[PDB]
Amino acid sequence: AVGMSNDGRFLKFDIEIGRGSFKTVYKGLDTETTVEVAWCELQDRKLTKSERQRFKEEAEMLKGLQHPNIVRFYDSWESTVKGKKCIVLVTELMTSGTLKTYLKRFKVMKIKVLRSWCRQILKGLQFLHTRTPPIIHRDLKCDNIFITGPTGSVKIGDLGLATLKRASFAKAVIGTPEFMAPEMYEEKYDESVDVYAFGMCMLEMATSEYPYSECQNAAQIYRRVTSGVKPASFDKVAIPEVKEIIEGCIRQNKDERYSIKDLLNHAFFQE
Numbered sequence: 001a002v003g004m005s006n007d008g009r010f011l012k013f014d015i016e017i018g019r020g021s022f023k024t025v026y027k028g029l030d031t032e033t034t035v036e037v038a039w040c041e042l043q044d045r046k047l048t049k050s051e052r053q054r055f056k057e058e059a060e061m062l063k064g065l066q067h068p069n070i071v072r073f074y075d076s077w078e079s080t081v082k083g084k085k086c087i088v089l090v091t092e093l094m095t096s097g098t099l100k101t102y103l104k105r106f107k108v109m110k111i112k113v114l115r116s117w118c119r120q121i122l123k124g125l126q127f128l129h130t131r132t133p134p135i136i137h138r139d140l141k142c143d144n145i146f147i148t149g150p151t152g153s154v155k156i157g158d159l160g161l162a163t164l165k166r167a168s169f170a171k172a173v174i175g176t177p178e179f180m181a182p183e184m185y186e187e188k189y190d191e192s193v194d195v196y197a198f199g200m201c202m203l204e205m206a207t208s209e210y211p212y213s214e215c216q217n218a219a220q221i222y223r224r225v226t227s228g229v230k231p232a233s234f235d236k237v238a239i240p241e242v243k244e245i246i247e248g249c250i251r252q253n254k255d256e257r258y259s260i261k262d263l264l265n266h267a268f269f270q271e
């Protein structure tokens with residue numbers, strides 16, 4: 001035990017359970033409920049004062065959200081220990097990994113699982129996009145879709161964090177180069193950014209590889225994405241119906257992409 005909220009409600013344990021894009025995640029406890037939570041520290045790095053204003057507001061709206069396919073958000077605050085400042089978020093603890101870990105671990109996803117899990121992602125997104133006002137995820141990826149069990153349901157996570165992962169910022173060329181929706185680079189986005197991201201997720205789940213692996217850096221990716229050049233893995237999608245859905249999601253022009261409604265209504269997404 002290595003920390004607590006200002007109110008003593010949440011404790012942090014000396015048990016690190018994730019480490020990633022500028023965060024460390026620990027096991028924790030809700031002392032009020034006596035139920036285990038994820039204690040995420042957004043790592044000694046500076047948020048802007050403007051981001052903090054947006055974040056105070058966001059955190060309060062996230063605390064209200066419930067849906068089967070969204071990871072629960074409990075509470076948030078700024079915390080320090082020694083010379084390190086972080087923002088803490090406390091969320092529902094997800095103990096069975098991510099779609100990314102699933103693909104790593106079990107090389108392939110069977111089509112009936114793909115269908116069900118993708119329908120659940122769409123239901124989650126429909127839910128967010130239909131909140132008033134709409135919630136746009138803006139950072140959906142296989143590593144932020146959590147599974148409740150190997151045989152369980154999927155829940156979308158890292159709501160909130162997407163605000164602090166900064167599309168229009170200059171960034172280092174380090175690790176695996178990333179893509180996003182064309183319009184996202186300019187921060188000129190709507191819900192359809194999530195549709196694009198969904199398409200990319202489906203592609204990954206269908207191919208068991210990260211799109212654009214044939215690119216060495218994010219500049220090559222940017223040039224391909226904003227010029228309508230598809231990832232090579234697109235051509236490797238085995239099932240034509242799956243490939244068709246992907247293709248309609250990852251259109252360069254946002255106005256031509258499937259809507260979530262149309263995807264949920266697609267033949268594929270009823271059994």
Ligand SMILES: O=[N+]([O-])c1cc(S(=O)(=O)C(Cl)(Cl)Br)ccc1NC1CCCCC1
Pocket residue numbers: 017018019020025038040071091092093094097098101143144146157158159
């Ligand atoms: O956001 N992550 O990427 C994440 C990854 C892991 S991991 O150990 O699976 C790994 Cl080693 Cl980061 Br892939 C654990 C927790 C988290 N945060 C979640 C935030 C909201 C849902 C609840 C927890």
